Amino acid sequence: GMKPIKEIADQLELKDDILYPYGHYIAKIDHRFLKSLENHEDGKLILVTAVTPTPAGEGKTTTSIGLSMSLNRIGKKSIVTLREPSLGPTLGLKGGATGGGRSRVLPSDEINLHFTGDMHAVASAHNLLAAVLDSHIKHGNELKIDITRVFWKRTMDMNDRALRSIVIGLGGSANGFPREDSFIITAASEVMAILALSENMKDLKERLGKIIVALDADRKIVRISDLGIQGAMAVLLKDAINPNLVQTTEGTPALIHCGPFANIAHGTNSIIATKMAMKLSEYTVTEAGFGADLGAEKFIDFVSRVGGFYPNAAVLVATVRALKYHGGANLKNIHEENLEALKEGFKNLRVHVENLRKFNLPVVVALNRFSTDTEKEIAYVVKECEKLGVRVAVSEVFKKGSEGGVELAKAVAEAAKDVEPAYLYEMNDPVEKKIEILAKEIYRAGRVEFSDTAKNALKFIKKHGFDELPVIVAKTPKSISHDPSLRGAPEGYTFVVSDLFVSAGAGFVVALSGDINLMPGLPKKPNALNMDVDDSGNIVGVS
């Protein structure tokens, strides 16, 4: 029951001269159009985030889409902006990255799979560098690359654990020099973070060239620019920089563009998409990955300053189940009423509301209702929110579309304002200081400790002039802390930083706590088993 993309484009007054179709239901918009609009006024920006994620699933993306649909429903022109999902995970398990129920972005199969080929473009560019690096070494290694100190990995958009740790370059002289390597899932690529952060092609190429590839035999930094390949990568990314226009279940507009990780990167869609939506609608609904401790913090302290914007409100997605989980309930019994676990778990919601207010944002709690939620449960969460002084609306967008999101849309429209920016750190505070602030203010730690490895990394960072970059914290999303086992609202603990690295092209330092999974595996019975093209030539099993 879908609108041709030209219809959607018309709603937004987009002309064909800047529209590049992909079939009848998708188009790219020329990114250069954004600069054209530079004298046009920006609308409101609504940041969608969530309580600490649980295995019960909180449906944030579904809620984002539903909010936008509901804003349009109440007569306020709105665009939802989303990350493009990785293909890999879908071949493993059905996921929620294109929403659910009556609150989806469409056409779902295409979005979930090849879409407009942006993931393939990133992989190509990324892998080209790797190929060129090895070939440089093969042909005489003029740059004196130390093959034990290559930071740059290969990539594929596939959930393939077999490629986590490999040995390449075997078979003899004609094949070059043996070394150890790894594949990461393509979304985790610094190329993807860069694509999401670039305003234009010049910006993109400059960023690509800055990427740190390796150390040489004298421990000097080798950059992409030293290989001279940044131009070719840019060419491979020339269409990928243009955001993708699609639609919601209800025929309202959506922009889907880029998919950086929300741990080792900033975890939101491209600044190009967000900025363009802001010129084209009254309410831009944009989400950030993981809980408000990760996605939302990164959105304010980093993305917003790159992008030259600031949210007018934050929506905190919560569920009764998630709160019971955070209160100590078993996942296996989560569908059963438990008002004591609920009361205790509410502390997690409280920390996120408080943290959000540290950024001076008005907050609206979106309580995603499940079938099994009791009225006592819903009533309690609502009352507790009222006592916090936070707007709250119950959301039923999965079941009802915008008819399930009216109260939420009105709360958001009522809450949104122009706020005085309140960043946690100055763009150029020392890395250690930024970390201390984040750990204190957001993760609610009593202190930070750096491992010896991290200490050595900090020395490297200072030596090479990166001590003033913004910091992107890569920690577990399962806790406000660094410890994935700590449910609820841990406080006053010792936050441990295990390591750090520099993403010089993206323009940030990553502070790591524990091991980060950059290449997820396949389950024993993968979703691919369900996938097919039926007798009628329709795709089944994907979404």
Residue 122 vs 262, nearer CB to a second copy:
122
Residue 408 sits at φ, ψ, to 5 deg, of -65, -45
Q: 332 vs 524, which CB is nearer to a second copy?
A: 524
Q: Note whether 318 and 291 are within 8 A (CB).
A: no
Smallest separation, CB 297 to a second copy (Å): 30
CA distance 108 to 502: 35
DSSP 294: I
Least gap, CB of 185 to a second copy (angstroms): 11
CA distance to 119, 151, 206, per residue, from 215 (Å):
28, 8, 20
- Chain residues in the site for a second copy (CB under 8 A): 16, 20-24, 28, 32, 87, 91, 113-114, 117, 120-121, 124, 127-128, 130-132, 134-135, 138-140, 156-171, 174-176, 201, 205, 228-229, 231-232, 234-236, 238-239, 521-524, 526, 528-529, 531-533, 537, 539, 541-542
Q: Which is nearer to a second copy, 161 or 417 (CB)?
A: 161
Select 147 or 318, whichever has its Cβ closest to a second copy.
147
Structure tokens at 207: 């960023």
Q: How far is the CB of 55 from a second copy (least distance, A)?
A: 19
**Least distance CB 469 / a second copy (angstroms):** 26
- Least CB distance to a second copy at residue 166 (A): 5
Report how far residue 66's alpha carbon sits from residue 405's, in angstroms, rounded to the nearest whole number. Answer: 6
Q: Which is nearer to a second copy, 331 or 533 (CB)?
A: 533
CB of 140 to a second copy, least distance (A): 8
Q: How far apart are CA 281 and CA 426, in angstroms?
A: 31
Write out the two tokens for 36.
Answer: 């054209």
Peptide bond into 107 cis (omega under 30): yes
- Looking at beta carbons only, is 62 or 124 nearer to a second copy? 124
| Annotated binding-site members | 54-61
DSSP string, 258-298: ----SSSS--B--HHHHHHHHHH-SEEEEEBSSSIIIIIHH
Binding site listing for ATP: 54-61
For the chain, how many residues are written?
543
Q: Mind spelling out the 3-state secondary structure of 299-359?
A: HHHHHHHHHCCCCCEEEEEECHHHHHHHCCCCHHHCCCCCHHHHHHHHHHHHHHHHHHHHC
What is the amino acid identity at position 31? H
